[PDB]
Amino acid sequence: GCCSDPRCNYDHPEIC
């Protein structure tokens, strides 16, 4: 999951 990854989370604040 994207939100699981801190980078992906920080990159996609709208999705996560």
Give, in degrees to the nearest 5, the angle at Cα 7 between 4 and 8: 60
CB under 8 Å to 16, separation ≥6 — which residues? 2, 3, 8, 9
The DSSP code for 16 is -
Q: For residue 2, give both structure tokens.
A: 């994207």
Are residues 2 and 12 in contact, defined by beta-carbon separation less than 8 angstroms? yes
Do the Cβ atoms of 15 and 9 come closer than 8 Å?
no
Instruction: Spell out the residues 6+ positions from residue 12 whose beta carbon is closer than 8 angstroms to its own.
Output: 2
How far, in whole angstroms, is CA 8 from its chain's centroid?
Answer: 3
Which DSSP state fits 13?
T
Report how far residue 3's alpha carbon sits from residue 15's, in angstroms, rounded to the nearest whole number: 8
Burial (CB count within 10 angstroms: exposed 0-12, middle 13-18, buried 19+), residue 3: exposed
